[PDB]
Design a protein around this ligand. Structure first.
Ligand SMILES: [Ca+2]
Ligand SMILES: [Ca+2]
Length: 87
């Protein structure tokens, strides 16, 4: 390893069973679920909190989703990551 694994961010995976890297990580938590040592509980991750979605990030338990219909006010393409407008 290198440095800062499950303590790189305010709350990664409560250093439970996570495999962190210079700029990423893994965990025993479902999917890429995030864990907390404060609560010592397992909870879905914030895949969008990082930098994956566009304007809107409906991050569901496990697999996030990136729509938009916000500032511009449109819709979410068929990619489920990028957003596009529609009339
Ligand atoms: Ca690291
Ligand atoms: Ca999630």
């Amino acid at each position: 390893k290198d440095v800062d694994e499950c303590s790189l961010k305010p709350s990664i995976c409560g250093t439970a069973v996570c495999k962190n890297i210079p700029g990423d990580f893994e965990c025993e938590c479902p999917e890429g679920y995030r864990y907390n040592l404060k609560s010592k509980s397992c909870e879905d991750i914030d895949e969008c909190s990082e930098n994956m979605c566009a304007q809107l990030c409906v991050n569901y338990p496990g697999g996030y989703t990136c729509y938009c219909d916000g500032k511009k006010g449109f819709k979410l393409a068929q990619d489920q990551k990028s957003c596009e407008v529609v009339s």
